[PDB]
């Protein structure tokens, strides 16, 4: 491939796509939570369910999306999905009857994001081979910037318009993504038979259970009997900025580690993520707690950004789409079941110091799993046993 030149506009499209998708998926939930803080709940336990249904629909639909990207092209899918998402976000403006809004926001939106998101990762590989880590790092950092700036963006520019009407504004971003999707240009379970890939997929899936809880459920602890001077917004924005920096750095470092050896980064990040969370209840000293949270933000980059390059390395470019699709398919149920499990474990034990103790087992187990991923040379050695 060109490995440069024109390939720097595709990064712009991918950054825009990821930023818009996740910015909407977080801002809509946050804004409805604010509205519920301002308005009555009359449905109550289902209204908060939307923010999880729509998110989970993205990952739970990827397995089928991978048979449209690989069967039509990285452009047509990435534009039709954006069009569907635009239509979904447009009709949501009407009266918010439970079932009607439920459908219009969980089956039109979210489902369209699944079509408009998986192609945003495949195409980059088709433009970078030796620098792909750098491109992925840049894209992840830009998407983090976009997400962290989006809810504030719509809030400030929203002009304090009512939620039902403000759904129309978000519709424009999907249309722009549809137009920007024009920039993309092309330059079954068979994949599971590769043991070296299936074991890695299992290792990633196991650590999902312990990734969402500490990364999202964190503020409850400082809201629960510990914090006296909270200013937690500072903590959250610090974690976001450090996650951006970590993603940017991890993108480049993978450029250095040759070939399959990259996976050792994932092991060293999973182990430290697991250990750190276990130290959050113990390192109560607010300065130390802030430092540990800062570390948590940095550890994020190695977790997510470096997954796509390793996926390309393991199976090459011709099967990157299917492998990534079936990897994202397995992270839906483990990821979406974590927060409820922690929030009911706090009830089982009655104090909110144990959720974190549960938050460190899944990722350490996953790290133990990844450490045994066979080397290509060793896998060949076993292959030499065929005779």
């Amino acid at each position, epitope marked *: 491939p060109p490995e440069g030149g024109f390939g720097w506009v595709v990064v712009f499209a991918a950054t825009w796509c990821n930023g818009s998708i996740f910015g909407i998926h977080n801002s809509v939930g946050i804004l409805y939570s604010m509205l519920l803080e301002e308005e009555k709940e009359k449905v109550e336990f289902q209204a908060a369910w939307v923010g999880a249904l729509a998110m989970g629909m993205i990952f739970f639909c990827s397995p089928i999306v991978s048979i449209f990207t690989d069967r039509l092209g990285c452009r047509i899918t990435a534009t039709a999905g954006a069009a569907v998402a635009f239509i979904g976000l447009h009709t949501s403006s009407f009266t918010s009857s439970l079932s009607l809004r439920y459908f219009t926001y969980g089956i039109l939106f979210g489902c369209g994001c699944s079509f408009a998101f998986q192609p945003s990762l495949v195409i980059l590989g088709h433009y970078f081979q030796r620098r792909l880590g750098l491109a992925n790092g840049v894209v992840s950092a830009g998407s983090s910037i976009f997400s962290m700036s989006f809810p504030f963006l719509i809030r400030m520019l929203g002009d304090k318009i009512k939620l039902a009407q403000t759904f129309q504004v978000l519709s424009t971003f999907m249309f722009v993504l549809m137009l920007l999707s024009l920039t993309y240009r092309p330059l079954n379970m068979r994949v599971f038979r590769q043991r070296t890939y299936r074991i890695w997929a299992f290792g990633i899936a196991a650590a999902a259970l312990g990734y969402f809880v500490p990364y999202v459920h964190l503020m409850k602890y400082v809201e629960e009997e510990f914090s006296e001077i909270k200013e937690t917004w500072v903590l959250l924005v610090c974690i976001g900025a450090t996650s951006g920096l970590g993603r940017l750095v991890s993108g480049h470092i993978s450029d250095s580690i040759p070939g399959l050896k990259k996976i050792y980064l994932q092991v060293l990040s999973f182990l430290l993520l697991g250990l750190m969370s276990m130290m959050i209840p113990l390192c109560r000293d607010f300065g130390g707690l802030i430092v540990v949270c800062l570390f948590l933000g940095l550890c994020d980059g190695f977790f997510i950004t470096i997954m796509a390059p390793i996926a390309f390395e393991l199976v090459g470019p011709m099967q990157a789409s299917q492998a990534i699709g079936y990897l994202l398919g397995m992270m839906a149920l483990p990821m979406i079941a974590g927060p409820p499990i922690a929030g009911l474990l706090r009830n089982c034990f009655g104090d909110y110091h144990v959720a974190f103790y549960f938050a460190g087992v899944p990722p350490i187990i996953g790290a133990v799993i990844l450490f045994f991923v066979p*080397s290509r*040379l060793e896998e060949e*050695l076993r292959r*030499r*046993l065929t*005779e």
Partner: nanobody, 121 residues
Framework: VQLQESGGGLVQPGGSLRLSCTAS???????????MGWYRQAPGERRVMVAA???????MYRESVQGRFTVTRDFTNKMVSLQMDNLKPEDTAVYYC?????????????WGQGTQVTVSS
């Protein structure tokens, strides 16, 4: 690059044997990213691997010999060592020392002349 011939031995049942080989012309840097081991060819049997040691230092074994024969990398001397214990009459075979190289297209192979190993029945 070639592995010098070595090995062999006639032993009684239950006996032990020690073997090794030498790598000629290989640099220590070139030795890394490669694995070394041994192969077996019993009467009427095709040349099949016995047990080797990977680049990471661990060893993969064949079903019929795992837990019976042991080897080590000996990377320091650019050599390889093989040892045996509790040999039995059916263990007789011609053992060939082989070295596999890491190569992007396909792993490259070196192997010297093996020697006959027989256990008296």
């Amino acid at each position: 690059v070639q592995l010098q011939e070595s090995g062999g031995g006639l032993v009684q049942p239950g006996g032990s044997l020690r073997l090794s080989c030498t790598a000629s012309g290989v640099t220590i840097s070139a030795l890394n990213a490669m694995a070394m081991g041994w192969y077996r060819q019993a009467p009427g049997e095709r040349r099949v691997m016995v047990a080797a040691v990977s680049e990471r230092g661990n060893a993969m074994y064949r079903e019929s010999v795992q837990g019976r024969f042991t080897v080590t990398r000996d990377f320091t001397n650019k050599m390889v060592s093989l040892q045996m214990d509790n040999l039995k009459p059916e263990d007789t075979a011609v053992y060939y020392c082989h070295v596999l190289e890491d190569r992007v297209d396909s792993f490259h192979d070196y192997w010297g002349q093996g020697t006959q190993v027989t256990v008296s029945s």
